[PDB]
Write a protein that binds this ligand. Structure first.
Ligand code: HEM
Ligand code: HEM
Ligand code: HEM
Ligand SMILES: [Ba+2]
Ligand SMILES: [Ba+2]
Ligand SMILES: [Cl-]
Ligand SMILES: [Cl-]
Ligand SMILES: [Fe+2]
Ligand SMILES: [Fe+2]
Ligand SMILES: [Fe+2]
Ligand SMILES: [Fe+2]
Ligand SMILES: [Fe+2]
Ligand SMILES: [Fe+2]
Ligand SMILES: [Fe+2]
Lengths: 154, 154, 155, 155, 154, 154, 154
């Protein structure tokens, strides 16, 4: 079918964000395993997998709209050097992606690509849940203290 | 059946206590989830459910005695801003409810409404169990220290 | 996350509506059990439980947006004195709540809080199902006659 | 195979009758659900499904005889405004369809299309069962009274 | 409930589209069986059933909004005389229905009938899935050649 | 542990090759689904997943050797415009990766990183199996003819 | 079969390393149980069992090559007096064994005893896994602090 060109552009922009998040979260996950914080690492690994599923949905939609999915580009990965930075890096990445998705929904609405809007709404819901999780973890560090927070992730 | 009007007044007073506790404990439960203290949040959620079952028993008894249950009124909720205050707010609320129930029992005994007395005895037992639980949590915070206590609630 | 303050005010307005409905329908459900209309009482009880679930969803959303859920306030309960009035009281309550949710959806859309719009959409759908059920019960009373309607609610 | 053109015209006439009935009974079934008479609505829905099966059999037979099935045309639906009229509308529709099928059987016999006669015989039998059911419902309304009849259709 | 009269008009317009598609796809399904292309016939039969379920949802919504569903009218059926034409006729029909649904969504949004909008969004999604399927079959015919395509449908 | 710096460099070079292959094969897989060649698309999808597993093993080894895995870089994706080109693109990518892996093994051997050598040997075995598969598919096209080959992939 | 005398010498050198590790890790395991650090004790016990299986494989290979396995000799055990020292003593022992195995591999390659080489490769892999585990425990002690680390081992 012939999709709106700007909708395909938003699908490819959010795809670049998802590919960036797959790699960041995958790297962070294996880094947490390497550090011996496997409980947090497992949660991080599942977030990487969730971004792979988002990327897969975007790619399928782009083909349906007759566009070419862009798997070539990546944003700069935000890599933490300890657990508090790791969480803040992931938070910054999801906050940036949230903005793309919110603008994509308003665009889909305006060009009456209402099925692409429902894909982006699903993504936005998952993105806010992940932001809420990250904000909670960063606040827990301060309340339980870093050493206890790290102990709980072993 | 025509119940004693002052027994029905005590049943409605305690129903107001129970509705206030449903709401305080439900709000506290969801606040604890929001803070990432899910273990304590799950327990607080079960206390809210316990108060809904007390309210249900009071409402059933009031109808049976030809009264109208009062679901309109609520006491001021005691909302904590952190875990220590949350526990102290629940304790204060249960101590106030315990005083109403002890008074209601003495009154049901004096007017020989012995089945209403048995319902209030069941509530008084559950209330003391909750007060004991709360007083223990408050003492544990001082023994294990607040950072450990909160770590254990994640 | 920092939610829009007017979206939070709509989530809180709808939370007061849901809290009112929990209590009206719970009271109505136990009143129906007391009258011996336990079939209708069981359905009314399940509607109260459905409102507790809507309240729970709104409370979670308000915390996520950094707001404080309002469990202190309640609208005036509309309490029926017989089965026809009980159904009419529930219908008036759901019609007023429908008006809030529909306004809240339009506001979420205009400030681009699309996740909060999806919560309100789900509640709107549940609310129209409930309104349809109530309008149907009021019409059935008229078609089968009140004494048959009540007979059918006995168990 | 080359079927008799007048047999194909009867298969198509009966197909229009079945298509009309699918739609009348589907609409009636959903109308009964909307009114809260779900027991009668479920039975009406199963009659609509039964007509879809008859339509399917006629369409297959028409293709086998090298004809083209007519799904474009429909008779005027007879839509009731209440339960007594709904049943009377269904009865009028089945009585008119009975007349077509009975004529079609006589024609199949006279041109020795005996397989098409057996399809029409099966439909005739189903149609008389449906007519008997409808006449019985109309008589029950009179014997138990409309308010009891409707009560019994609530669920 | 009293629905918007123009929303009910869109629900009835789409109901006419769906009834036309039930019949076109059922006829095409049985024609494919008659031709010995049972695999494609089974798929076309399932698309007809899918349109009956869409029609059922529209009828239920119209009653709920105090309208009368229109099962009297049908559009002209687009009947193919071979497999390539059959697929092109279904595609043309779904493209026309897609235009009605997109218009109905924009209208339900403008008048704030947001539950009717959600029903039309579900239909629009199913419709694009079917259009994608049809456009793919038409492209496969040119890639594998018509004789192979038909062989695969036996 | 302190890994040889050039071993880590080879692990990161083969990681870039694996990330390139994940994306190429994932894109090719969903493109084959879009074209209606799902049997080939499923096989392509499983090759993408196999490259994800290779990438995961490389990343874990790099952390163990105290290096930082590079998920930022990608080679130019070789994207086909039809099935014969798709297969030739995948073949060219695996032939290029084969050279990196063969040089990595000789390097690991020379610096006595014998455990990294065994990882690269496993990769080389999987790479040759995939090359053999691709060479076979390209020869089958010529023997059965393209239209039959495509028909068999539907 | 007549094995190379220097290969048999390496098999016996590594057998001495393995016997020393069986005993060091078994003693450390039972010391950890004695101290009440059962979780860490269970892991240390499984490492001792792993070294018994390595010793068993070396003994079998030596017999096969017509040598006599040396179970008479042991290196000096490195015994810790607390948990941090215990971990550092195991790490030192595994680092020394890793050096013998890397040398033995290079020698088996040079004299073309390729089956003995494959046995030493298996041991080298298991050894690096244990070294990585130990280096991680030592880093966790500094991140979570010694009191938390020990708490987690109870
Ligand atoms: C184009 C980017 C990618 C896409 C679309 C993608 C897609 C997928 C999908 C759909 C799954 C299965 C999800 C499920 O059903 O459970 C999966 C699994 C996985 N992916 Fe990815 N992926 C991508 C990139 C990566 C990267 C860059 C890595 C690591 C370097 C990776 C590692 C994994 C792992 C370890 C699994 C688990 C699969 C298994 O063995 O069960 N992926 N991927
Ligand atoms: C009149 C006040 C209320 C009454 C009488 C009431 C009654 C009940 C009862 C009897 C139950 C099931 C008890 C059981 O586990 O067997 C229940 C469940 C529940 N109530 Fe309430 N409730 C009230 C107010 C509330 C409020 C304010 C909330 C706040 C959201 C709430 C949320 C819930 C939830 C989440 C459940 C769990 C539902 C389930 O899965 O079974 N309730 N309520
Ligand atoms: C008002 C138009 C129609 C409506 C609303 C309708 C509705 C339905 C529904 C809801 C089903 C079952 C859906 C499911 O699988 O769960 C069904 C089944 C079926 N319909 Fe229709 N239908 C319509 C017209 C037709 C027409 C024109 C035909 C042509 C013969 C037809 C033939 C069938 C057949 C063969 C089945 C399968 C029955 C079974 O085994 O369950 N329908 N219909
Ligand atoms: Ba601790
Ligand atoms: Ba009766
Ligand atoms: Cl702990
Ligand atoms: Cl009865
Ligand atoms: Fe995502
Ligand atoms: Fe209580
Ligand atoms: Fe609600
Ligand atoms: Fe029929
Ligand atoms: Fe449809
Ligand atoms: Fe690979
Ligand atoms: Fe060993």
């Amino acid at each position: 079918m012939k999709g709106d060109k700007t909708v395909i552009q938003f699908l490819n922009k959010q795809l670049t964000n998802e590919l960036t998040a797959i790699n960041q979260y995958f790297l962070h996950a294996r880094m947490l395993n390497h550090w011996g914080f496997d409980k947090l690492g497992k949660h991080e690994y599942e977030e990487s997998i969730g971004e792979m599923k988002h990327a897969d949905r975007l790619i399928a939609r782009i083909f349906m709209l007759d566009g070419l999915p862009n798997l070539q580009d990546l944003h700069k990965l935000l890599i933490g050097e300890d657990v508090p930075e790791l969480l803040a890096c992931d938070l910054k990445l999801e906050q940036a992606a949230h903005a793309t998705v919110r603008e994509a929904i308003a665009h889909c609405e305006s060009v009456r690509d209402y099925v692409s809007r429902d894909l982006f709404q699903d993504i936005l819901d998952d993105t806010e849940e992940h932001i809420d999780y990250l904000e909670t973890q960063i606040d827990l560090i301060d309340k339980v203290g870093l050493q206890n927070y790290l102990q709980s992730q072993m």
